[PDB]
């Protein structure tokens, strides 16, 4: 019926002023735009159809053409920044916001989806969607006593669009918009649907990706324990954003990091630091590195949870990016820790994998490892046990690599290596 029309026929139908002819042609355009292989978005745009679709959005008396034009515009807005811009330039934003309160659930869901695509383009369109007043009707769609009474696809789409309103930086979303959205986010973070949980954690991870005041806005809502619980989940699409949120949070103050620790997060890290998905291991090790940059009592809680052997393991064998994060974790540990904590780290076996990493072609990791070793040597000086450490370094091949690093391109590398062999 309306399958595989030409763009020319679609234009002919839309440019009649027979409402039914226009609806037929609009559905034909929707079907064209919802095909998987190269939908002709740019042909539709060049034919001048966007203003006609936008005007169809306002035809309250004919709900089907509202739906079909909303779907067509959704798919146009899902494309490149220029295609989304063409949708915005046609005045689509206020018309979609108007459709949010439509009595037909599929139409308001379509408007939710379209606003999600538009806001997901970036900071400017996100803030423009916000300025047109989308947040109030979006949140009103979720003001029900139990979220389980909403249709699952509807709820997932609302969660995804809210996460896009929470997304992107330079600038971050407006503070009052974040404050307005957060309670609904907290409630969605306790819903039972895995996709809703994943997208809620994504929103929270966006909101915690910034300065300590943003992190504090999130942390004050009390979501950290629920984030830890989701960190323990079996579904990788949930664990990934949960772990990103937790790592973002521990980039903040020592008190925010302490909130992460009190919630029980460290007990999950034996799994995370051996997780078979490389990115999980990398981000867990980065999170650990930001925890070992904290207070000595926090370093001590890392010790008590048995996590130093897991750091040794990741340093010994992992993807190289994960190994670099582990080297960072070790240098933070050795710079902030007491003498007994550094002794314990040596007794767990850090020295040999630390040395083995000194044969890497990465200048930053060489600097990091050299700083770590000098910190360890300083603690050994306090204990008068420095040459036992030097013999330990030489028996595993460390002295050879440190001495070779004297004839190295980077000036800081050569300086630190020469200092080490001159002193010890």
């Amino acid at each position: 019926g309306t399958v595989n029309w030409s763009v020319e026929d679609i234009v002919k139908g839309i440019n009649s002023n027979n409402l039914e002819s226009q609806l037929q042609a609009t559905q034909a355009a929707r079907k064209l735009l919802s095909r998987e292989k190269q939908p002709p978005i740019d042909n539709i745009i060049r034919a001048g159809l966007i203003p006609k679709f936008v005007s169809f959005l306002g035809k309250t008396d004919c709900s089907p053409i509202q739906f079909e034009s909303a779907w067509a515009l959704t798919n146009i807005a899902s494309g490149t920044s220029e295609q989304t811009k063409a949708v915005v330039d046609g005045g689509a934003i206020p018309a979609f916001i108007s459709l949010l309160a439509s009595p037909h659930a599929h139409i308001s869901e379509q408007a939710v989806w379209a606003l999600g695509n538009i806001a997901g383009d970036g900071s400017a369109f996100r803030d423009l969607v916000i300025k047109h007043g989308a947040i109030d009707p979006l949140l009103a769609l979720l003001a029900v006593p139990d979220l389980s009474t909403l249709a699952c696809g509807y709820l997932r789409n609302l969660t995804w669009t809210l996460s896009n309103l929470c997304r992107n930086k330079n600038p971050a979303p407006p503070l009052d918009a974040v404050e307005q959205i957060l309670p609904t986010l907290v409630r969605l973070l306790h819903h039972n649907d895995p996709e809703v949980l994943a997208d809620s954690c994504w929103a929270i991870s966006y909101l915690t990706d910034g300065p300590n005041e943003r992190i504090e806005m999130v942390v004050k809502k009390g979501v950290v324990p629920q984030l830890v619980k989701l960190l323990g989940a079996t579904e990788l699409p949930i664990v990934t954003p949960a772990l990103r949120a937790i790592g973002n949070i521990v980039t903040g103050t020592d008190e925010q990091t302490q909130k992460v620790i009190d919630a029980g997060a460290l007990a999950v890290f034996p799994s995370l630091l051996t997780n078979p998905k490389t990115n999980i291991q990398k981000e867990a090790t980065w999170t650990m590195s930001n925890i070992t940059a904290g207070r000595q009592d926090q370093i001590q809680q890392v010790v008590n949870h048995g996590l130093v052997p897991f750091l040794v393991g990741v340093l010994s064998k992992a993807d190289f990016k994960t190994q670099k994060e582990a080297a960072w974790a070790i240098t933070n540990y050795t710079s902030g820790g007491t003498v007994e904590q550094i002794v314990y780290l040596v007794h767990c076996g850090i020295i040999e994998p630390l040395m083995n990493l000194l044969s890497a072609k990465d200048t930053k990791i060489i600097q990091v490892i050299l700083d770590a070793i000098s910190n360890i040597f300083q603690a050994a000086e306090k204990l008068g046990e420095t040459e036992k450490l030097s013999i330990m370094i030489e028996e595993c091949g460390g002295l050879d690599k440190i001495e070779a690093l004297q004839r190295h391109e980077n000036e800081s590398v050569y300086k630190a290596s020469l200092n080490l062999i001159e002193k010890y």
Binding site: N75, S78, G79, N164
Partner: peptide
């Protein structure tokens, strides 16, 4: 990721 086509 950021945008979603409705098929």
């Amino acid at each position: 990721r950021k945008k979603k086509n409705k098929a």
